[PDB]
């Protein structure tokens, strides 16, 4: 086992949540890891809509914005290309996905337009991608709109590849909890009290994983932050372990890009 490197202890896992401890690591590294896990992992989402028939009570960009946030399966996103790089005109077969939506309110009672009715008509080339993410029991997923008697909606959707640094729709992580030093041994926070600070502030669940300090011990002025407690939840598109692994990979690639540029510049200086 790699005893010279960062250590990890998973305590809990599921389809959505991973709950773990990260030890023997700096604070800067853990912070950068969480920043990348939230902001810089690609995913597949709807990026353009064109509408044929709209006899609803809502607007057009309203429904466009509603569609732009629906989650879709993006496990194999490494085999697509940024549409600004593909040589195709407009959208490719290798640099986009295409879906169609059609609905009509034939019945007297109002009819809901969910996200289970998005149908893919492009060619996937045997890649696991584009499927809508469904997490409810009934399987309907995100409800999109509402229809009455004699109302129809027809439109076509183009979904592309990007990151969360340009829109919140491509983000695969909902919210990640990041804690450390629940006993305030390092004196990083200073408490606010009325009578007794030790009682007004509740205790974190994490206190059980460290030993309380003793009043006879002088302030330890040599310690550093080393143990962090994280919890990560996914929107649903990517598996959560893949979220963590891809965050690490993206950080590695960024540092490697820095290294390559530095080597190139050193070769230039040689000239």
């Amino acid at each position: 086992m790699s005893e010279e490197g960062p250590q990890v202890k998973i305590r809990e896992a599921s389809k959505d949540n991973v709950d773990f401890i990260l030890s023997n690591v700096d604070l800067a590294m853990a912070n950068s890891l969480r920043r990348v896990m939230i902001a810089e992992i690609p995913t597949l989402a709807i990026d353009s809509v064109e509408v044929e028939t709209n006899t609803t009570v809502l607007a057009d960009e309203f429904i466009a914005h509603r569609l732009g946030l629906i989650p879709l399966q993006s496990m194999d996103i490494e085999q697509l290309e940024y549409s600004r790089d593909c040589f195709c005109e407009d959208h490719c077969d290798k640099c986009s996905v295409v879906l169609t939506l059609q609905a009509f309110g034939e019945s007297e009672s109002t009819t809901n337009v969910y996200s289970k009715d998005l149908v893919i008509v492009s060619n996937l080339m045997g890649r696991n991608i584009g499927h809508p993410i469904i997490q409810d029991k009934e399987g309907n997923g995100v409800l999109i709109c509402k229809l009455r008697k004699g109302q129809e909606l027809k439109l076509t959707c183009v979904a592309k590849k990007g990151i969360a640094k340009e829109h919140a729709k491509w983000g695969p992580a909902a919210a990640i909890e990041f804690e450390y030093d629940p006993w305030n041994k390092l004196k990083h926070t200073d408490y606010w009290y009325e009578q007794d600070s030790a009682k007004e502030w509740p205790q974190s669940k994490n206190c059980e994983y460290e030993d309380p300090p003793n009043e006879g011990d002088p302030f330890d002025y040599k310690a550093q932050a080393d143990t962090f407690y994280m919890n990560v939840e996914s929107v649903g598109s990517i598996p959560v372990d893949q979220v963590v692994v891809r965050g690490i990979d993206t950080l590695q690639k960024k540092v490697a890009s820095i290294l390559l540029a530095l080597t190139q510049m050193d070769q230039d200086k040689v000239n």
């Binding site: 809901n112 009934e138 919210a175």
Partner: protein, 70 residues
């Protein structure tokens, strides 16, 4: 106006749970807090999304874009 698909704060998705949330309120006759917690809404921002929603889509729907008076 139909329920927001996502939570404005923590990025979570609450859009699909509105239909099932309405079920617990009269079929099971539960209170609002326990019904909100029954669907995994634990941060109070998601509870804010679901709890304070004015569903105006059922009023426009009894109506047409043609001939309102004053």
């Amino acid at each position: 106006m139909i329920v927001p698909v996502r939570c404005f704060s923590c990025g979570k998705v609450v859009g699909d749970k509105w239909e099932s949330y309405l079920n617990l309120l009269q079929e099971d006759e539960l209170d609002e807090g326990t019904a909100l917690s029954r669907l995994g809404l634990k941060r109070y921002c998601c509870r804010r999304m679901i709890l304070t929603h004015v569903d105006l889509i059922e009023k426009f729907l009894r109506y047409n874009p043609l001939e309102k008076r004053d």
